[PDB]
Design a protein around this ligand. Structure first.
Ligand SMILES: Nc1nc2c(ncn2[C@@H]2O[C@H](COP(=O)(O)OP(=O)(O)O)[C@@H](O)[C@H]2O)c(=O)[nH]1
Ligand SMILES: [Mg+2]
Length: 167
């Protein structure tokens, strides 16, 4: 197809849960066991083929530390979609993700598409958040949920493409 679409996506979530790794896997097909903590935010782009459309993603990878919380609106205000990330081995990060979802529902665009990534799914032997519980939470809050692994690539391209399909 010759159609072209571009949308703004922001990633939010506690640090560290693998936010930068998720983006790096999607954008560069890389995974770094040793990642420097993000300072403020990082910007990345990726262009893909979705049926008959060429879709370009403008992605804001936010630093998740609480001291950066006040800067989050700079990145989500104009966002068409968000991926709120948690780590499936860390229940506290899952609770933090629900608070990010609440903030987006109240302060971001009313039509923003919100995805929820239960990351580090390759560490299921250390699971702290039940898949079905997360799925139910996502269903009840109209969120696009998938467990992902930046380390193995599991569902990484899939969650980004699913968001694009719904925009
Ligand atoms: N096992 C595993 N480690 C991961 C995964 N995603 C990220 N990590 C690791 O967890 C750490 C934090 O990741 P990073 O992307 O910097 O987290 P951020 O602080 O949320 O941006 C790094 O040591 C990564 O290699 C994943 O899916 N599986
Ligand atoms: Mg980061």
């Amino acid at each position: 197809g010759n159609k072209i679409c571009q949308f703004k996506l922001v990633l939010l979530g506690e640090s560290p849960v693998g936010k930068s790794s998720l983006v790096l896997r999607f954008v560069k097909g890389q995974f770094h066991e040793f990642q420097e903590s993000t300072i403020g935010a990082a910007f990345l782009t990726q262009t893909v083929c979705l049926d008959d459309t060429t879709v370009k993603f403008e992605i804001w990878d936010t630093a998740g530390q609480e001291r950066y919380h006040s800067l989050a609106p700079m990145y989500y205000r104009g966002a068409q979609a968000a991926i709120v990330v948690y780590d499936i081995t860390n229940e506290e990060s899952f609770a933090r993700a629900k608070n990010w979802v609440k903030e987006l529902q109240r302060q971001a665009s009313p039509n923003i598409v919100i995805a929820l990534s239960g990351n580090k799914a390759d560490l299921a032997n250390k699971r702290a958040v039940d898949f079905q519980e997360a799925q139910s939470y996502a269903d009840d809050n109209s969120l696009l949920f998938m467990e992902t692994s930046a380390k193995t690539s599991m569902n990484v391209n899939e969650i980004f493409m699913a968001i694009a399909k719904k925009l």
